[PDB]
Ligand binder design. Structure first.
Ligand SMILES: Cc1cc2nc3c(=O)[nH]c(=O)nc-3n(C[C@H](O)[C@H](O)[C@H](O)COP(=O)(O)O)c2cc1C
Ligand SMILES: Cc1cc2nc3c(=O)[nH]c(=O)nc-3n(C[C@H](O)[C@H](O)[C@H](O)COP(=O)(O)O)c2cc1C
Ligand SMILES: Cc1cc2nc3c(=O)[nH]c(=O)nc-3n(C[C@H](O)[C@H](O)[C@H](O)COP(=O)(O)O)c2cc1C
Ligand SMILES: Cc1cc2nc3c(=O)[nH]c(=O)nc-3n(C[C@H](O)[C@H](O)[C@H](O)COP(=O)(O)O)c2cc1C
Lengths: 340, 340, 340, 340
């Protein structure tokens, strides 16, 4: 029973057992408000590894306390976070899943109390706070925080790191001309608006030589913002800097009313894959095994990412295999229930 | 929810109530072996019209008796066939379906007793018979038989006509260099191997002014054969000759093995639609309403063709509406059962 | 996996190929308003025989014009009706299905113009017309119409006859104390209210030796009306008179609605089956193969009746076999679609 | 639609939020071979509590080391087991589920090294070991082990206790004349063969005042073994002793090969419920919301037990609610996916 959905995939000596990925999903469940792993996370993430998902990516994890979305986020801004993340790594990997971490900074979308920072002092909307415009010292300090976060992730035992450059947060605010009005070398041209992302990538590669992903918002959905043609030259540069895969999302940069439907972001993933010759991940209302097999076999992406479907059924790989008429290995404790 | 699957579609005066098409499927049910419509056909085709399919296309209907696949095929080589075909048109259109017919000739894949014909004297495999190499008289007669079929179909009251240029049958044999070895003006170059189809199209347009479809095999799956790049200039020719829509299939030219999977021929249909600027229809392992709405909304085709799924469930349009969370009109007798 | 659902069942020399029955459903499609079969019926009923239903029972067919529910009903009050009914017998049985007919009289629920009849001059509700109370001449005449209908059904070639004694129509109106207030020998005790049904059964048996069904409403859903415990002695008497199977429905006697749920009338079918030791049919929100196998294997009924599900999917037996993990014979034309 | 499946149920002061139960299932995952709770159990059981199951019952938990089925079973023979079991109770109850424990002793079906015990010295089959026939002192010691296990369950915080009297294990060996050949007061009449179970129940009630379940095998499937008529007087006695619910299974006493089908043990649950006037649990090939609602609404049982279906989909309650057209509360972290 040949499917491509259940075939392995290798990225520089890390091999995933199938093409299914659990997409990063904030849980707002750090009840002690100090960034640390709690019981909620130690059941939530291993459930999907028992369910035979090949790669589990943690929710947006803040590289400074000021870069959290909410006070109940996970964090990696302290050497004290390494012990709890290491325990989580061990509980997921015992089931044969590999594990990744999404490194985040919320920028002008931070909801935490106190000062918040951004490339330019413009609020996201009339209902949100005006941020402080970063100085050159703030830029150097934030690039160093991403480096320190990557070192701690290596020390905890993660297999993959992803940089969050999407959905209107700090790095996306530097990339889009809707939010970046700067007059120094970090603004004022397509090359200068890339510079913050390029320096974050270079700083992570100084301490991390394993698989590296970047997640992007391929369109701003605005007449004066970016579209996928602007991201084709940016993806070519990321490949030269040693990024292995682009995880292709869209929007949340500007309030916009957009039409949503099955696979509505798949064309962005295939444009980047074919025009820049780099591996890609697809995401957005992917909910069935039949659908996912078509995406992979026609070369539209290399990995399929699922978020809301794995909140409804965390053992979706069993259901997807039945739909495709194939079989997969089961946890030995569940063999009497996993009949094909 | 407004969907594209249940939106109308108009071609040169003919309006289809939705984008769903029942693909042509031989039934081998002419038990008198004279090509005439039988009781089986008068239940089989009207069942799918009650089911709310927008357009129903009859099985390959042979334009000469020598051009049948089997002795139990439907035929249109006599004025005697008009009467039984007219009754069938009337039974289908009662329910709001439009109806079309696929004119065919089997060439060297014919299984009927006696002499069979081809563009060159090469059999399909080592297990099949060797065809006679067609003379110039044979060519003009066969072109003429296609014109007579179209005239008879217009007389019977069909809405749409389709020419069968695919799956290794007679027109496909002229198109392919794997089977056409001719040294006259019907072989030896891209312009020459197109000529037979070009003439068949012109002869049909002499007697028929309604929507005209053509079905192609977009790849031979063979190192020395055709690929979709060869069919882009052919589709531009057909558009200029007044063909309205290309029905995109593939294969069955060369005895071989190929791996099939959901939507495996959709990339051929999108390449023809985009590069030759002509409407297309997609076919091949399309089974769900979720899948069909993706094809249409990402612009990969204009109509979706189903075969085996309509043998398993002839009222598939109700089930597809329910999967997409929309509603469609039901036959008034069935309103207590068709609850959305 | 062998199932009872797809095992044969023999009654008095008639063998059904499985336990699945198309329950009677009015179509309101006699557009010439003379009771004759139309093209609608000649597609509708054979579609379910192609889908492999074992027994197809026609909609309520009126034994007098006055006994029609509406002007567009099927009828059997004239020898002229035999010809069209026999065409429909031939079209259904060609596929291996057996065929039955439900003989009806609408009573005080009739909607046709002019005088309507009933045991007692009481309207069904405030909004309906008041009926004439039947004389003894009217009772004898109406019994004779049921006998003539059965003779016509034998002549047309039916395999099974069913008497409609349910859903508040004429015979149900004699059985219930809610509707029957008579003071002659047709009212005022359990034996007197049974008398009209007992006399219809004897008159049919004078002309018909094949399988005989009766459909009942086993509860009135009223504190002063009938319950299943009243029907147990009536079923013991029906067995002595030569009825072969009781088709067990409920309600529609008092003008109120009730809360329904899956299998809500199965306890009535099993109480009649076990306490009167007679074969029974179950009906009401039976929609899946898993459900149908449980009814049969636990001895709750001998045949399963489906109405609304067979309007949504007329090839349900293929889907039920896949759900149960078993295989069934397919029509030869559909073998490449009906994969198990 | 209000359903009974999602209505609450109260037993002697414990309220369950719905009627769905996770049936006991051995995991053979105590890798330290000392009966203690491990990381496997701390993810496996809370997964179904997040999935909104109302009552979770732990796998057979051995009251002595000699009563284990395998060396990898959970146990409750030491005060050192209480700490790990209490942690597991807290992790499950955090989500609104209630939690139970099944107390077991494998008798002659034990696989551990050394001596094993039974009412009589007859092996289970030719391939298994001959057990020691128990003395009166062995009987007193084993009843005391069940009491000590019940006391530790209370110390750990469980809501419900179940006694395992089924599937051929030690208490079932005393009940059945196939395995009990004793000539003293524990064998040779229906009252004498009940005596071991009756003394276990009384010893548990001395230390436990909460809800008490007993699981039975209602048939041995053997001409000289027990049938459901033997268990009607047993269930009347258990009610008098203060048992609150009978959990009704069958078989695994003698090597019969019975033919199973959906709901094949539900008629046993309904016979005990109606004849002894005691609440019952139904189990056995129950997989759909449609099926479970019929069992409850037709009064066949009070709770529905699932085993293999919750190994395939641990969030089954979400799917069953959708199938029945109702809604239920979701974990707040999952509200964006649990849409209905
Ligand atoms: C509760 C929730 C939390 C999410 N958190 C993140 C996140 O931390 N980082 C991120 O890049 N996307 C996040 N997303 C977006 C998803 O990863 C995904 O891109 C989106 O929901 C579309 O995929 P789906 O249709 O499979 O849900 C979140 C989505 C949800 C519903
Ligand atoms: C029984 C059967 C008969 C068919 N007959 C024809 C035919 O007469 N002409 C044609 O062009 N294709 C014919 N086909 C091919 C189908 O039209 C369709 O292209 C193919 O089955 C793939 O679509 P599907 O996956 O929806 O079945 C037939 C297929 C089947 C199974
Ligand atoms: C449109 C329609 C017509 C029906 N006509 C009849 C009828 O003529 N005679 C009869 O006994 N029941 C009739 N019924 C009742 C059905 O036979 C069946 O008893 C009922 O619909 C419950 O079964 P279901 O849940 O499978 O639909 C009809 C039901 C419908 C929806
Ligand atoms: C892996 C497995 C372990 C089981 N362990 C137990 C057990 O410890 N105690 C018990 O009474 N039944 C046990 N059973 C039987 C189940 O509880 C249940 O009665 C049976 O599987 C039928 O229900 P189902 O069709 O929903 O699986 C087990 C079944 C399985 C498949």
């Amino acid at each position: 029973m040949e499917t491509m959905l259940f075939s392995p995939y290798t990225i520089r000596g890390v091999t995933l057992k199938n093409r299914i990925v659990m997409s990063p999903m904030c849980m707002f469940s750090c009840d002690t408000e100090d960034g640390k792993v709690r019981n909620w996370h130690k059941i939530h993430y291993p459930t999907r590894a028992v369910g035979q998902v090949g790669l589990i990516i943690l929710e947006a994890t803040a590289v400074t306390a000021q870069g959290r979305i909410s006070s109940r986020d996970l964090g990696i801004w302290s050497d004290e976070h390494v012990g709890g993340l290491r325990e989580l790594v061990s509980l997921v990997k015992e089931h044969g899943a590999k594990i990744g971490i999404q490194l985040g900074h919320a920028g002008r979308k931070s909801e935490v109390d106190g000062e918040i920072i951004a490339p330019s002092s413009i609020p996201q909307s009339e209902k949100t706070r005006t941020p402080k415009e970063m100085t050159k010292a703030d830029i150097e300090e934030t690039i160093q925080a991403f480096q320190n976060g990557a070192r701690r992730a290596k020390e905890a035992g993660f297999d993959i790191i992803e940089i969050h450059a999407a959905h209107g947060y700090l790095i996306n605010e530097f990339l889009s001309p809707l939010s970046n009005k700067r007059q120094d070398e970090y603004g004022g041209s397509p090359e200068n608006r890339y510079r913050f992302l390029g320096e974050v990538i270079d700083a992570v590669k100084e301490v991390w030589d394993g698989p590296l992903f970047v997640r992007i918002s391929a369109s701003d959905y605005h007449p004066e913002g970016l579209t996928v043609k602007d991201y084709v030259p940016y993806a070519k540069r990321m490949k030269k800097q040693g990024v292995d895969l682009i995880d292709v999302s869209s929007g949340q940069v500007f309030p916009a009313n957009i039409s949503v439907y099955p696979g509505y972001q798949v064309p962005f993933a295939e444009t980047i894959r074919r025009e820049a010759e780099i591996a890609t991940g697809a995401v957005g209302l992917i909910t069935s095994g039949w659908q996912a097999e078509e995406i992979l076999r026609n070369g539209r992406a290399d990995l399929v990412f699922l978020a809301r479907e794995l909140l409804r059924n965390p053992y979706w790989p069993y259901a997807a295999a039945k739909e495709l008429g194939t079989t997969i290995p089961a946890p030995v404790q569940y063999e009497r229930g996993w009949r094909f």
